Symmetry: C3
Subunit: 186 residues, 3 copies
């Protein structure tokens, strides 16, 4: 894929193209899903640029930013029988990796008896922002499945499901002293 002039004016009527170049409305549920992946990817970039994460988190998050483009390519390309070219799809491989990162980073942390108030470190607060945006993207991914239960894979949404759980764990690690707990009705 190529990024040259950037502005082509081909979407000035409110329509645009999926990856097979078929035309959709810019409100199409599939587009909203991989659009929200774009927005989640930018939230992680904000966390990387203002958060000063250590080397090992920067490598995990950079892989996730790359996975999010894999996920968008998946969502933007309709599923067809025997495609001429084999499409890039999300695989259980991706989710297993996320679960391993969850278990590893969640090992050294204790249980919580209530919700944490987002904030603390610049890195911890921005991971929380990214966490909520990924969760919004997950909802859009599931809505895309509802709209096209054959043409859209469930694996992008399952990836986004596990990812927001990992981002939560990482947000706690970025507050190595501890985060403030919600006190109901306090």
């Amino acid at each position: 894929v190529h990024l040259t002039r950037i502005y082509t004016r081909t979407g000035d009527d409110g329509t645009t193209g999926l990856s097979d170049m078929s035309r959709v409305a810019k409100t199409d549920a599939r587009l909203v899903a991989y659009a929200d992946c774009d927005e989640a990817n930018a939230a992680i970039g904000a966390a990387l640029a203002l958060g000063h994460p250590d080397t090992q988190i920067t490598d995990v998050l950079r892989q996730i930013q790359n996975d999010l483009f894999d996920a968008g390519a998946d969502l933007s390309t309709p599923i067809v029988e025997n495609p001429k070219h084999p499409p890039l799809r999300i695989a259980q491989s991706y989710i297993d990796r996320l679960e391993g990162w969850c278990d590893a980073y969640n090992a050294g942390l204790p249980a919580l008896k209530s919700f944490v108030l987002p904030g603390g470190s610049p890195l911890s607060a921005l991971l929380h922002v990214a966490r909520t945006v990924v969760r919004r993207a997950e909802r859009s991914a599931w809505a895309a499945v509802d709209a096209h239960p054959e043409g859209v894979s469930v694996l992008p949404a399952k990836y986004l499901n596990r990812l927001s759980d990992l981002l939560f764990i990482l947000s706690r690690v970025a507050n190595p002293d501890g985060d403030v707990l919600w006190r109901p009705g306090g």
Copy 2:
């Protein structure tokens, strides 16, 4: 409530649970409402972590972050007749408090004859971001009322209504010199 393993895989089919553990689609309007409260809460955490607010704003905003979890507990728990346990609900008490903070912080500021361009301080700009996210959450809260006018309270949405007004006032105070005014068609 307990946060332990974090990832349970019970939502890998696009369904999830309200606080009474009844099952809903992850696109359910009630969930979208308290999801957007989560996103607004994270925006305030970004304002607290990168904004360096003074002591008195940090205490006001920390209370709001706690109120937002009260509001989410409200929205996530259907209203029923004579519940076995009494549920945590938002009350006029919450909104009266917000109005007092509005009046107090708006006392020392002058009138405006047009809109302000968001920006200035890191604290002022991030309060504006939080302001717009809270307003998005308010719209979702009202949509939840439309979907379930008996099972959902109007008070969460009324809290979110007044809250975005307070966040605007606080955004001006964080620009103690003044913000740039919109000039129509300038």
Copy 3:
């Protein structure tokens, strides 16, 4: 227009006013469109306040923040035949200006053979966040056209279309060394 008490309680029933003071639901597609313009405007303010953009970008972005209020005034005011007062509307003039900024700032940059991972500079990462929020606003603007193809202009949405292309170019310029490229399935 005047900003005085801020909180009027007139929207505590989930209704609110367009610029002609006619009443709409707070979920009205037109309101969602200029609400999303507000959210995009705040994202640019975050980019201006934490990004330390040079003088020439700050002047371009400040003009865009002003255009976004022009665009919201357009979207919030229904189109009518022979209005008593002439309404502020977006014009091709606005979009031509954006295209000139695109061409000028895109001149000194090379082609790309794949997507860039958002991040890098605080300014570059926050421009990416703003880029994705503007794109979300564009989708809402097109949905407003669908709901009211006579009462809503297409020009706000076309402005938002070109604007996200410009924000992308500016995000690259704020990484004068280069951004990381997506590697499919890497």
